[PDB]
Amino acid sequence: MRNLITLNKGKFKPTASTAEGDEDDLSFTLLDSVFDTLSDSITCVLGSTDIGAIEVQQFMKDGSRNVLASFNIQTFDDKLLSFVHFADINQLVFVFEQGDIITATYDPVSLDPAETLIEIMGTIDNGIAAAQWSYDEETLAMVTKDRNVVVLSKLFEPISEYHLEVDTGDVTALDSHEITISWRGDCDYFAVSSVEEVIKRRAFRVFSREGQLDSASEPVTGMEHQLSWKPQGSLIASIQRKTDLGEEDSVDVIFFERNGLRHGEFDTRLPLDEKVESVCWNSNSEALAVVLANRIQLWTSKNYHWYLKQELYASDISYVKWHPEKDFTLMFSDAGFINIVDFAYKMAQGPTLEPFDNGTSLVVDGRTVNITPLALANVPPPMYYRDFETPGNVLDVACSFSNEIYAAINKDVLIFAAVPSIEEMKKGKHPSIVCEFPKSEFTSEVDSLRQVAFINDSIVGVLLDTDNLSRIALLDIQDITQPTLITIVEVYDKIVLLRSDFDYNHLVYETRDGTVCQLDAEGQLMEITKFPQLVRDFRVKRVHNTSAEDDDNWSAESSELVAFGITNNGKLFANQVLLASAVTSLEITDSFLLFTTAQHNLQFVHLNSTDFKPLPLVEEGVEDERVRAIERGSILVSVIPSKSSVVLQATRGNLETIYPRIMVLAEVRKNIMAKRYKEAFIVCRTHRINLDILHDYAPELFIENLEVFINQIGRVDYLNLFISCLSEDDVTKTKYKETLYSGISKSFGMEPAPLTEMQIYMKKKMFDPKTSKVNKICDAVLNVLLSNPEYKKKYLQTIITAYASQNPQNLSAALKLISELENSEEKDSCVTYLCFLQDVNVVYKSALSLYDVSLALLVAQKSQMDPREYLPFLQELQDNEPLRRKFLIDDYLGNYEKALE
């Protein structure tokens, strides 16, 4: 349920230095370009085809430039196939169609040209068709033009050599006959696509690092020649243009596995008269990019469903390469302009205030914008909830503050969508398209569209981008249909992110330098801060300082804008403080900061202060209030504070809405100081917190307003749950430590040691006088419902638990009021409840002690005793005189002095 966005796009034309040093170069066509992992630079080659001339130039990311080699070749008209740079043995290599392995060597300290050697290091008889290096840069896999595949080493000495042999699938009428080579992510395997006739058929063969045939493919029809390999271990990801008439007449993307079998498909929603020229996997996984003639679109997949999260536009694509080390950055070449573009994730969502909460997530699936408000319907990532269709290919989305207005941009058009109300949204209405505001009224043809935002559902901010600079546009969407323009504010840098702040009352952005500025509804730029490094995801709000007793120690209240972001490698910053150093996701809330740690935890930071210090390190026994364990990489998606609930998403693709302890307590403590006691009690039972928060947080407000607690808790089966399950220690100082008014750099208080055998007796070494917490409130419960005549009618059963839960164990007063119950059989229904929470012979000896023998009979029948023992003993006690009985009854029990009286 996560999208893709464009961070930066910077184009430039690599021109080749003429010997006369002027303008008007003849052609100098751009051939190829690679990356450099050891220099943070880009190595590109230039050349000509009429004259056998070449050029190579290194571009460091500071404006500098070097020229590494410039010589001339024989065999004039040809083309280049592969080019790689080792950058440790400072050697350049070349592979041509004419079978040349021309190499070059430079020196790292004197960057002048023409001090380079040129050897040949091998010549292939009768041409080379394809060539490719390995990811370990150890092995070539070039295919000769005479239908023969060879394998070399780094020192260019041959390893082995294999000549090949030759319902059945057809070949479509759109393909050309070239050869493509693709490696396994961990090498020792590669694959070679080729054409045979037996009818003409395109297939491929899988080889080892040595020249050994392993497997061949299935004959599927119309293999368009595009070939690749998922570097995780499977999924060759071919095309299979389907030329069958009917409904099944689309163009797909089909997958394979290394034994040559068929496994998996998905549909690419394209017209049929369009040429697919390339397909590329990124460095690790989770991003597939197919290359058209003038257009590049990226495909991702989660639960076996593919998405079209992003799409790039250009004029003429020739080659597309991903980055080896870092992911989500790639380059291409459009009419001679090498342009770097880099990507990141984003979760376009709504507000987080406790009103207008309705936590709404907005994802992109090609030509549609899928919606899921997780406070109304908890829809898993495969299905969605009341989507809406568009005449476009949505690149980025944003919603308003009432989240009834939906914006989604395309190429050369900007499209609004609206909802009448949030409760009639729930009845079944999809969002209706309202107006299609084109890209001709607020800018020229030369600008592009990247991002969009809102502010208090009245102005729409739109991130434009020029080739040199970048500016944002403000709009007026009161009277949503027929919108009008507000002035085109401009800033003299290149914007990376654009986002509305928390409360949606301003907009914030970020340049390449890390400078975060703030923009109001009429275009007044206000700088906030500058991060130490480039952050790829940040949030902005205005925190407030609040002391303990809410206007205490009151002098000169203040506030300060704080920015909360995580950079690429995982440093969480907050105005250059470096909170943590392995964070991978975040989402802010009112009164809380939330982030995951990649040590498989989910920890909280309060937002009532303004000082920020680095965090205490978490260790394996933390148990404070602010750490909960996470499985193997579940990240944030949204926070719903009005339900006190946090939604996550795991790696395999499910959802998981944990209910964290820090916010469930944060609402029950709000209700018991608001004197509610019923909305507080229900949350105490469904989440299974220790049930005596109602006393152990306001210990003097409870007893003072206890008659309200009995009237509001109107049920008998809950009051018997309150009194029975009471501890003897204080839960506020042991488990629920209320870490709010407690600072930031306070160490996480570990769990107590296990109370072993000598500590058990030294816990109850001090028994319980008339000062314990149990006997205080159990008396106080009896203080009210032993006064009115009607309170001991309905709540007569909880009186039995109120006595029998004490440390003096006042069973003699519980068994006294049972004997006065004369109306019905409720002596049976009460003694069967008193003998459950106490041993029965303990009740039997106590019922025997208050000198009424008919009560002791009913207790003994519940006692699994032999009826020949007690019943004869009860018969001798019945017929005597009363004073004769009170001596006989005390010899049995041990009350010898009381017997003697």
Partner: protein
């Protein structure tokens, strides 16, 4: 306490795919067309369940009654028993034999003496030694609309399908008799009928190598087609008179060494999501019978020890219960999409000690499926099991309080329906539910 597991075997018969294929499965041992004397299919006759069956001569009233009272001569003090059927292809038997079989399964608990299937389950509802479910294993081509509602009349709640492979070539070359795209379609009609679907998987089959085993099981939980509620891991054993014994004879099939196999199942359990359980890691075959394959009978603990020094904890719902006191518990839920519907998994957890208290399953009834008459007149939602271990008592009524509030609001349903077994039909009648056919439902 707990649940008593009484295993019975039906009459020794022939699978029904021997006719049009020419023979049974390549790896299957035993059966009538074998050398084991009087043994059910996929058994050898030397198993402790398969030795009680031969002495009973497969009489269902006498096989079950001797097993039940044996377990209370040891002194388990049984009052809740869950039957499981095994051996053969029970739903391939004739119709007048299958219904009379299930009737005498119920009469061994109630004491009623009769032959009507519609009346024996009514006497069995007010039984005191009660049945909480019947597990019946079958093939994926025997879960049509004619067979799924016969199991509802029998009292069946959980059913098991042998999948054993997710590739198309393996189900063809082992003469399995169906396709893998057919079993992912019959999972959808089974889960929308309300069954706990458990599948069987078999590593080390022929022509599936070492690396293909780990992308087989990674797909099984990432793909929303399968994502079932249980597994039984059954590694391939070479037996004497089987079909793959000749492949072992001529040297065209060799098995795994017992250091790479325990490394494999230490990685398979690492990917197990917290809503499914692993019933078995191997099956009860006495090792003198087996020629190649698994050496010992302790692969469960050797797999848990091998992932101790990898840092990875198996988060399995069979492992993560009380079997250590909670002292506290939280309420979490999980939401995944499985083969046409929105599954949810409510549970009570401790994230520190990694222990479970109770669980529950619930499903939105889809629209492409759900042929049942009771689930068509209005939009309904199906609760599929409730399972509470062991105050520590009110965990049942909390999971039913929350699954009903989430059905009216978030599902938008007018009726909730339970697939409770026959002996536990009275636990739901106190909570306001009413019986309508096989289900124990209520208008919302």
């Amino acid at each position: 306490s707990g649940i008593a597991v009484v295993a019975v075997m039906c009459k020794p018969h022939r699978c029904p795919h021997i006719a049009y294929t020419g023979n049974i499965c390549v790896y299957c041992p035993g059966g009538p067309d074998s050398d084991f004397e009087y043994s059910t299919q996929s058994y050898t006759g030397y198993e402790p369940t398969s030795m009680r069956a031969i002495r009973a001569r497969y009489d269902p009233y006498e096989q079950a009654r001797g097993r039940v009272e044996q377990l209370k001569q040891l002194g388990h003090s049984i009052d809740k028993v869950e039957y499981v059927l095994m051996g053969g292809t029970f739903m391939s038997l004739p119709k007048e034999y299958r219904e009379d079989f299930i009737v005498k399964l119920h009469n061994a608990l109630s004491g009623f003496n009769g032959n009507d299937i519609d009346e024996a389950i009514l006497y069995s509802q007010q039984s005191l030694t009660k049945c909480v479910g019947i597990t019946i294993e079958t093939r994926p081509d025997y879960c049509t609309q004619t067979h799924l509602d016969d199991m509802l009349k029998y009292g069946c709640t959980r059913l098991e399908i042998g999948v054993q492979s997710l590739y198309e070539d393996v189900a063809r070359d082992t003469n399995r008799g169906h396709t893998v795209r057919s079993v992912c379609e019959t999972f959808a009609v089974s889960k929308d009928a309300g069954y706990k679907v458990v599948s069987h998987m078999m590593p080390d089959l022929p022509n599936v190598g070492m690396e293909r085993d780990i992308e087989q099981f990674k797909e099984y939980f990432e793909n929303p087609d399968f994502r079932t509620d249980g597994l039984k891991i059954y590694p391939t054993l070479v037996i004497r008179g089987t079909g793959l014994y000749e492949l072992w004879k001529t040297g065209r099939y060799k098995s795994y060494s017992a250091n790479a196999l325990v490394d494999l199942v230490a990685r398979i359990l690492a990917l197990v999501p917290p809503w499914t359980r692993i019933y078995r890691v191997q099956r009860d075959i006495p090792m003198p019978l087996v020629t190649s394959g698994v050496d010992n009978g302790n692969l469960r603990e050797l797999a848990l020890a091998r992932m101790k020094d990898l840092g990875t904890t198996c988060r399995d719902v069979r492992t993560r219960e009380v079997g250590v006191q909670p002292d506290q518990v939280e309420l979490i839920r999980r939401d995944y999409y499985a083969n046409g519907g929105w599954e949810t998994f409510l549970s009570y957890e401790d994230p520190k000690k990694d222990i479970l208290i109770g669980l529950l399953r619930l499903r939105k009834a889809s629209k492409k499926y759900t042929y049942r008459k009771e689930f068509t007149s209005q939009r309904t939602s199906i609760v599929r099991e409730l399972h509470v271990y062991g105050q520590h008592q009110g965990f049942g009524t909390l999971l039913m309080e929350e699954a009903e509030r989430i059905a009216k609001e978030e599902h938008g349903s007018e009726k909730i329906s339970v697939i409770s077994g026959v002996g536990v039909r009275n636990y739901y009648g106190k909570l306001g539910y009413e019986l309508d056919g096989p289900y124990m439902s209520k208008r919302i």
